[PDB]
Structure 1
Amino acid sequence: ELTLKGVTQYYAYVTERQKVHCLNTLFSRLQINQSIIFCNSSQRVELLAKKISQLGYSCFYIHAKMRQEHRNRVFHDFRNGLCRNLVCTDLFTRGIDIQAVNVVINFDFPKLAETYLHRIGRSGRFGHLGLAINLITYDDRFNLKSIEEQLGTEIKPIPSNIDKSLY
């Protein structure tokens, strides 16, 4: 199954208007090799890809309303590293297994702990060190603590300076 062993998890309290601002601040301040950003719909995935490219960052995106061959080839190109950011929905049955992805960002926080695990979790006891940064809104405040409890982990507030040795 999946565990959250090497994944240091943080949360940032935001409103929907502040999410793009928060993501750009994360991009600027954080030392990201590669990153995967999860959204709760394909529409929002495409809109966030547009916003990311506007801010000056290249972007990959995949979602459900796609031909599986296009999706697979885009995922292969992202694993090879042609672009450093990948925006996607929930279509990972297995845990992500890319050593270069040291930051995962839940742009839209999920409601079920199973989804949070499938986005953030790792396979085996020796996963690479990573960050998990959750953008939490008011309507997410209870699901945050509920998912934090169900999985027996802790999701701390994000500090203004994150230890570089964690990711």
Structure 2
Amino acid sequence: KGVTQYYAYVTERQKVHCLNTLFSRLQINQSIIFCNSSQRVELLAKKISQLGYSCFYIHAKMRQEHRNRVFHDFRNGLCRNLVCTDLFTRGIDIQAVNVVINFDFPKLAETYLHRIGRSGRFGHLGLAINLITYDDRFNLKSIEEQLGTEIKPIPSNI
């Protein structure tokens, strides 16, 4: 809570196109982009890196020492964006992160709250953008029900 939450309906195939649009329309100080698996993190990161994004990635198939080095460098602004999975962002507080992108929508309310909390800093407005496929509809409802909140559609200006 403390962050504005939006969603857009997309297909899996269209997600990178959507990401490119978001990163061409939003004001991103730093962002964290969440995916649902290590393989998907690494593939996405290599791909957007080739296209000129500034990004590091973190996931499960790394040593903790390495993840700690990448987080440290990310906090120091050596890259603008971090692509990562859930398991390892526990307790990370980087004040500059003003945008969280759920590139893959999570399956659980607990995970959802942990993720979007990464863009919420006291005295700073944050934004969470959720890419929702047809297959994510039941989990979107469950999560909205549990939190007692409505995730609004992306504004027209995007």
TM over 0.5: yes
> Against the structure 1 CA distance between its residues 125 and 72, is the aligned structure 2 distance closer, same or farther, given a 3 Å change threshold?
closer
Pair 1:27–1:93, CA change in 2 (3 A): closer
Contact 2:100/2:127, CA 8 A, preserved across alignment: yes
Greater shift after overlay, 115-124 or 133-142? 115-124
| Deviation readout 1:93-141 (Å, 9 max, x if unpaired) | 6454222110000000011111101111269993621000000000001
Match of 2:97 in 1: 101
Could you say if the C-alpha distance between residues 122 and 42 of structure 1 is closer, same or farther in structure 2, counting changes exceeding 3 Å? Answer: closer
Q: Percent of aligned pairs with the same residue?
A: 100
Deviating above 6 A after TM superposition, structure 1's stretches of 4 or more consecutive aligned residues are: 122-125
The runs of 5 or more residues in structure 2 that have no matched partner are none
Report if the CA contact (8 A) 1:92-1:118 is conserved.
no
Q: How far off its partner does 1:148 sit?
A: 1.2
Distance 1:54 1:6 in 2: 34
Gap runs ≥5 in structure 1 = 163-167
Shift of 1:78: 0.2
The answer to whether the Cα contact below 8 Å between 1:95 and 1:123 also exists between their aligned partners in 2 is no
Whole-Å Cα distance in 2 between the matches of residues 133 and 123 of structure 1? 11
